[PDB]
Amino acid sequence: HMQEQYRPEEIESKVQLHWDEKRTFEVTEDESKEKYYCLSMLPYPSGRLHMGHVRNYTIGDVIARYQRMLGKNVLQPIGWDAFGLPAEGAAVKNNTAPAPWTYDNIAYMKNQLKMLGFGYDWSRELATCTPEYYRWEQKFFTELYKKGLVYKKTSAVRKEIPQWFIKITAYADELLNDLDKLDHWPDTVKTMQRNWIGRSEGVEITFNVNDYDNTLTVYTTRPDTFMGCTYLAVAAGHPLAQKAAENNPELAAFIDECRNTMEKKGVDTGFKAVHPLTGEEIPVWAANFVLMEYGTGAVMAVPGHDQRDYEFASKYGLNIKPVILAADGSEPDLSQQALTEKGVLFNSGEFNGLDHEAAFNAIADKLTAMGVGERKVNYRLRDWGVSRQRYWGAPIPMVTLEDGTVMPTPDDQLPVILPEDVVMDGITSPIKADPEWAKTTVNGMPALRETDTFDTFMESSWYYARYTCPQYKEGMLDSEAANYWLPVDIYIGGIEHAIMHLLYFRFFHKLMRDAGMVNSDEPAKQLLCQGMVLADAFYYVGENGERNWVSPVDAIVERDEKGRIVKAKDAAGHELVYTGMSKMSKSKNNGIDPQVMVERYGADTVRLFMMFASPADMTLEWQESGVEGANRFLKRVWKLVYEHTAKGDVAALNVDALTENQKALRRDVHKTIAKVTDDIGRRQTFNTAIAAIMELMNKLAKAPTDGEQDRALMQEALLAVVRMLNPFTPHICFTLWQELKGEGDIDNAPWPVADEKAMVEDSTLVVVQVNGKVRAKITVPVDATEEQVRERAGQEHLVAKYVIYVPGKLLNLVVG
RNA sequence: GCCCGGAUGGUGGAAUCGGUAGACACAAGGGAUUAAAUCCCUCGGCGUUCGCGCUGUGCGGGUUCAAGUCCCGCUCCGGGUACC
Ligand SMILES: *P([O])(=O)O[C][C]1O[C](N2[C]=NC3=C([N])N=[C]N=C32)[C]2O[B@]3(O[C]12)O[C]([C][N])C1=C(Br)[C]=[C]C(O[C][C][C]N([C])[C]C2=[C][C]=[C][C]=[C]2)=C13
């Protein structure tokens, strides 16, 4: 009783309900099956899904459904990165609280994800704003504090705000070195992490300052140039600069100008530091290019060999000394710029003649012996600031006794619950505004608990591991369950997370490994960064000179003979400027609502277009015509199955009794199976895999369907096609598999395997070239020798008119 | 300015660690059909006797029998970034 028309509104919600009733995608830690952990970055509950979520999650679902078909035990989890700033403002504007707003958004977006047919294990679903989740990061933060990895300090955000830090710098070498294990991670992401880590090898040099109580220590990556140091430079916010700023209004003004935010700017402090090797006095200047946060907040200036110092000394008349020769051993030309390149020393006394590595070592060694030097490794990577002065976050489990002592919240008081029934005044966090909230009792003593909450990247740093044991009440992780599934096989997300989430979850993994929780070094094997979804963008210039962005749907376009947009207007008469394909946005007004598209064409059409239009890691250009083309293709697949099943049951296929035509058509079915298998599994080229299925569908629509063996071959092809399309379009394929009388549910059906005997080509095509230009195309047996292929090539008349040989492919003959 | 990318028909894209350039789809133009929609052929440019011939992967070069693919440049494009 198959329907003639393909109507997704009659197929999809029934097929989705079936997946919920049968718990089809719910998995456990089954040791008899090879596991596969396919993860996609968890969504933030903003209210509605965007095309970027649809692309990310379709990619993940294609892999999870295919890996299942190969007989693997697949974990495809989903959850909600539910804490965050956008709930705080939306609660105020909508006269509600961040919690019911978030839970309403989770419920609406969850329905949207189900309407897309993503095969998630919904029993492992998590909301990171529930105490059942954040209680484990609170307990883990108390353990890190006891391990010496957590400290508090006032840092600059400009306001100096006291913050909680986790020492990520204690793991920097490992984060850096373990990038060489990440062969299935993109080079871009790895480069961004190497650069963001910024490992640096140098020397700390300490100086004595005349009429100043403390010493002054600088950090240098070029100690070889120490004899060409003519002055020192400190940050504006540096202690020495602030001491001198009292008897200096010129310096006091500069420090304030710096605080109230590539040109150089500086004021001489008036302090004189003594060069440890010459005993000479050099001035100490306050500089704008020196960061207080990096190293010691002070540098040694060698204007002759550092370009920042060159421009600083040239502007302020400071001394520029040459101490490094140019590559050819000649003295450098410092009249226009600094000599940056590393080389042999001169004007360096006992250090003359030493090459770069020898000069670096000898000067570092000499100073180290004198007590005024020591090698130091610094990192651009700053410690992880994890606290926020915001309400909608997980409470920090730290307390301050009346004693003045600071300690973690005791285990028997965990979790520190964030109250959800609150009224937001927009100005202050309800847990800060109510003075009684922070008043607690710890170790029998009155205490004030932390009112700052964790930043949301704390919950996203370990969610991937919590999906392995989401209802485990005895700890953060069940090591047995975690190690069964971890590391993640493929993590699908965006490159925009390279140096934030993609680095924090690597660090968090190692902390868990070092706590005994996991037995692996890295959280994810392969990282697949999907590209942005693009849409056309138009704007008109208003009478006031303002740009008003118009949605492409609202643009009436005029095209040339070659279909390119030549002129465009809107229904109001405004002349539109087409800007091309760009990132979807609210500023550009060109966003496409995936819910509008799923209701218009069905989830399978939307799913298939996004996998077909472009390679997963490249940008996708949203085109209405391309989505309609995908819709038409699914209707052609439906039509071929409708007509085939309308002819009743089929006979058993006999490969031994096949016609020359019937065998060649079967060979194309099996060669397609092999290509689609390699494109989805090994290459991850879903577009070429869908193209191969479309090419085969074109052939099947031309094949005869009258005759026992024609109908039996068509049965083998339609059962294979429906299974190959299933990861992309699971709802239509679930239904078509039932119409074709396939065994069980297509979700539990095996992935089609190519019959090696069906793909034995008895002959091959040899392109015959003479001087590289193709002149002939011949057909020779696959078992033929080179002599047989050359004799047959010579027999061709056009070849005869006019020696490299590739078996079964090419034969080129250079003209002599 | 720096870093890392990228450049193939009218468009998205294919050609998988050199060997038939443009698969597959969209757009367009013919065909069936009483406008839309769907189905069926044609389709890089130029020339053509309509058979095809010549050329063609941003621009120059190099290795090679052979380069879209590998290497060095120049131009244009894109994302990221801020004296560490
Ligand atoms: P990092 O490690 O990288 O760096 C270091 C350096 O820098 C400086 N500093 C220090 N500290 C500081 C702060 N705080 N801020 C700012 N800055 C700073 C110093 O300087 B040096 O080293 C160090 O020393 C010397 C004298 N000035 C020198 C020279 Br003679 C030369 C050079 C230098 O430095 C530079 C480096 C930077 N960068 C890395 C560069 C580059 C970039 C890109 C490309 C290439 C290169 C110095």
Author numbering: 0 to 156, 185 to 288, 298 to 838, 847 to 860
Any passages from the paper?
Here, we report the discovery of potent boron-based compounds that inhibit an unprecedented target of Wolbachia, leucyl-tRNA synthetase (LeuRS), and demonstrate that inhibition of this microbiota target is an efficient approach to arrest the growth of its host. The editing site of LeuRS plays a key role to maintain fidelity in protein translation by hydrolyzing tRNALeu mischarged to noncognate amino acids such as norvaline. Altogether, these experiments show that benzoxaborole inhibitors of Wolbachia LeuRS are prodrugs that, in an enzyme-independent manner, form adducts with adenosine substrates. The adducts then bind with potent nanomolar affinity into the Wolbachia LeuRS editing site and efficiently compete with the physiological substrate norvaline.
Next, we sought to investigate whether these Wolbachia LeuRS inhibitors can form tRNALeu adducts that bind into the LeuRS editing site as other 3-aminomethyl benzoxaboroles have been observed as adducts with the tRNALeu terminal base (adenosine-76). The main difference between the adducts formed by tRNALeu terminal adenosine and AMP is the orientation of the phenyl group of Cmpd9 or, by analogy, the amido-thiazole group of Cmpd6.
